[PDB]
Amino acid sequence: RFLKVKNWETEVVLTDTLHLKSTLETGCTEYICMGSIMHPSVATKDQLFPLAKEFIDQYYSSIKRFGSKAHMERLEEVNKEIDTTSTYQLKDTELIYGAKHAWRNASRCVGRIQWSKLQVFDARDCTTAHGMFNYICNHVKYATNKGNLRSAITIFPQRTDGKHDFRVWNSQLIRYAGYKQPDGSTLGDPANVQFTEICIQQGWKPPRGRFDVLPLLLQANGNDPELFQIPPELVLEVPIRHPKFEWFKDLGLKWYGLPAVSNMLLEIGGLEFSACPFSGWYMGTEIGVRDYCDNSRYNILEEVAKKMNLDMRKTSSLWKDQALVEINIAVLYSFQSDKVTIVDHHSATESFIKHMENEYRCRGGCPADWVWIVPPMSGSITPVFHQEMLNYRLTPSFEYQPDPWNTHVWKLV
Amino acid sequence: PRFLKVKNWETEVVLTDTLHLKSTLETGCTEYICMGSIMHPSQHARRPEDVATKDQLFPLAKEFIDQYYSSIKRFGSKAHMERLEEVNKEIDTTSTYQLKDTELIYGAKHAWRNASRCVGRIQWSKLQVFDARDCTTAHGMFNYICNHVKYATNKGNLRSAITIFPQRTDGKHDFRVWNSQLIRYAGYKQPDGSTLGDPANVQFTEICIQQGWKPPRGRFDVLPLLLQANGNDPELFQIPPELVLEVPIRHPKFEWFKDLGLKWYGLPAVSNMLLEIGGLEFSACPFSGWYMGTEIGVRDYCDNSRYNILEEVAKKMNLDMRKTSSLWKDQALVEINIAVLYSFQSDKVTIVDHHSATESFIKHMENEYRCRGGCPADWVWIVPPMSGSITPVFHQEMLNYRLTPSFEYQPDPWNTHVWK
Ligand code: HEM
Ligand code: HEM
Ligand SMILES: CNCc1cc(F)c(F)c(-c2cc(C)cc(N)n2)c1
Ligand SMILES: CNCc1cc(F)c(F)c(-c2cc(C)cc(N)n2)c1
Ligand SMILES: C[C@H](O)[C@H](O)[C@H]1CNc2nc(N)[nH]c(=O)c2N1
Ligand SMILES: C[C@H](O)[C@H](O)[C@H]1CNc2nc(N)[nH]c(=O)c2N1
Ligand SMILES: [Zn+2]
């Protein structure tokens, strides 16, 4: 069985063979499609043998050493551990191959043309929150690279019994605080209200300002998480100004420069890495459309259109649209001026289409999520809009996981 | 399964979907692979392409009559059981059956209601059905279409209408509108390599000139109708222009915009789909509503393979066009959709912007979950081609499934027509 996807802008057609090699579900059924559902739906020794065999097989295939003496020895070696220890350990090479392919298989990621240039920071020797703080700081300093961003992931000890998980309680490493006011308004980032509350509660002395960098909240080996303030000289920030509008700098906006996801789970060979913060660089619309303009978030459209003398009475004037465009010009122009790496939604999408042709050619497919790949503004004038994409889940994968405050049971009396 | 919840990540509203249990045919998806962005994911059809046997056709018929009498508080009534036997006899002697007039309107309004790709479904029960099953010629098809176009245009106060020609019989006597929409502009290939007019319609314009249409060869030449009746060679007809409402596009601020020289037509009328009810297939069924602004201004004007007027506009706006990062396409694309909306409203011609229309679809969604237990939706299609995340629907989970009666795709007839 093969499968064809079409680009209706170019008529190009690709043949996905790779979809045959996927295992866990997409959510969809034969008769219902869950392609827009955000979240649809500890392994024993016997569970873990075939998963590990799948990954070791895949690894030695990738390096044209399948069925070799070095392959068949490793297979025996992994079974020895799963028999003995009821788990096993990845070699360093495997953990780099695994982290890279988990990015490769991220169907919601438009930046995967860069996947093979991932810097893997092995942190599986870490034992304390202070250890995690150190590793993360060096990750940030490395990845930030004085505005010239580099992709990296730092991987902490895998799961054991689920009672001793390393976790980064932050959703991303660098995020701004939210505080809800007595009158009901929200200062800073309304998304991080709940997380700001935990921080404050644990010790944090908040500045109570509009762009406070949250502290890291870190859990090592299943113990109560611990607070740490990222040294400010390592948090690269960009103050947002518009090249046409002088008044724009007076909106007082900035953003962090380094997008670093820390709440997800890295699954390689049946092993789960519950704290695996990874990072790259930003696409313009992530800040300019979602962070700044979503009604749940910084929600600055009215403020901006007002300073634009826009008729904000009826919707058909497209004031919201007109203002959104200007704001993403601000974000790109601001980053570019402070020489902070960034990619606009056009450049990014054109790259992804090339990556996708490329991947269908050497790899035989590339699982994509149209609902996520298409930018959240100017959708149809980017090429991915006209690109049919097959969605399936390959492993290694990045996975969602419970929020650790809903699950953790506290030590401290 | 048992109940699937959908959720709106901007209001945390959750909706519980049971309507999907009554879904009859495949989506294209499997538990191991999602096809939600394939345009034609499936070829699962409820009956073979040609005249079907009794056990092939009756059960679909039994399915629809049963659902219709259910819809109107019967089921088991004398009129329902007499109907079931009437469809039995009628298939037992003509290999098809005929829909009562109540039955025909029910299915039509429900094919719209079930159309998961239509953001405009909140109006579904206010459809006007023109029964055209007594039709026998391309000339009759032209008369019926003409009245439709006049009723629906209503001097700019658009009304939704569908006109239903005779159901497919053995397949060789198909009725077909060969136009994709009733009113579309022409596409002319240029001797250099460029294109004049709407390049989506080049292959069609060719067939029309080839059939003897004398092309005026401009950028907004309304195309002729090519109408096929009872399997016979199709016939050209010019729609009288006093019936084709057109809006010249101007801009409320840029007075230079009127000189781009663009207009659009007011009546979106889809005429190439196949309406299916109780296993019957109405291969010709033009239907019309009113435009969402983006359709014209985002897709029609701004796709590369369409009119592609982006750079020509950005020039007049004097935009930084060296590199993408200046968002010059983004910037022009907004002015264009403001222009379109402003022109339609200034000519009192019905139109709906993307914000109003998407909000309404959220309300439709509630209405449907409250009374029906669900509402099938195609997120990929419902979200507008610009400014997605600032509209309500971008943040709303949607469940997609195939209910019958439905509107189906069908091959372009010239791929499958045996000319006379
Ligand atoms: C190098 C430049 C990168 C760019 C431009 C980029 C871009 C993006 C964007 C725009 C999204 C959508 C996220 C959202 O809107 O919430 C995304 C999702 C994602 N990216 Fe990338 N990314 C990059 C690097 C990486 C790296 C290094 C990894 C993994 C190590 C990664 C893995 C993912 C994953 C797993 C998702 C899905 C997020 C989710 O499902 O919530 N990306 N990416
Ligand atoms: C009354 C106002 C209406 C609005 C605002 C509206 C809006 C839309 C839009 C914007 C699309 C996507 C079109 C595209 O980009 O190709 C669509 C699709 C569709 N609409 Fe509606 N529509 C309306 C009326 C109707 C009516 C009267 C019918 C049938 C009686 C209908 C049936 C459909 C179908 C079947 C599709 C899918 C088209 C396809 O698959 O190619 N709509 N609608
Ligand atoms: C919870 N949604 C996931 C999510 C939220 C964000 F804010 C992000 F920034 C990214 C993201 C991640 C990477 C590695 C690069 C990039 N450009 N974006 C992903
Ligand atoms: C080929 N896809 C279908 C398609 C193409 C178009 F050009 C349209 F205009 C519409 C359409 C149809 C109706 C009834 C209302 C509306 N607002 N749009 C649909
Ligand atoms: C590949 C993708 O599914 C395809 O381009 C679809 C996406 N969604 C769409 N949505 C609408 N309304 N109209 C379209 O033509 C498309 N095209
Ligand atoms: C419900 C729907 O799946 C949800 O709104 C998704 C749509 N696509 C997205 N795409 C990106 N990149 N980010 C998002 O948060 C979302 N949200
Ligand atoms: Zn699906």
UniProtKB/Swiss-Prot annotation, chain A:
Ubiquitinated; mediated by STUB1/CHIP in the presence of Hsp70 and Hsp40 (in vitro). L-arginine binds at residues 172, 281-282, 286. (6R)-L-erythro-5,6,7,8-tetrahydrobiopterin binds at residues 36, 371-372, 385. One of its GO terms (biological process) is positive regulation of adenylate cyclase-activating G protein-coupled receptor signaling pathway. Heme b binds at residues 109, 400. Belongs to the NOS family. Homodimer. Interacts with DLG4; the interaction possibly being prevented by the association between NOS1 and CAPON. Forms a ternary complex with CAPON and RASD1. Forms a ternary complex with CAPON and SYN1. Interacts with ZDHHC23. Interacts with NOSIP; which may impair its synaptic location. Interacts with HTR4. Interacts with SLC6A4. Interacts with VAC14. Interacts (via N-terminal domain) with DLG4 (via N-terminal tandem pair of PDZ domains). Interacts with SLC6A4. Produces nitric oxide (NO) which is a messenger molecule with diverse functions throughout the body. In the brain and peripheral nervous system, NO displays many properties of a neurotransmitter. Probably has nitrosylase activity and mediates cysteine S-nitrosylation of cytoplasmic target proteins such SRR. This is Nitric oxide synthase 1. It comes from Homo sapiens (Human). The gene is NOS1. The chain holds residues 304 to 722 of 1434 of the full protein.
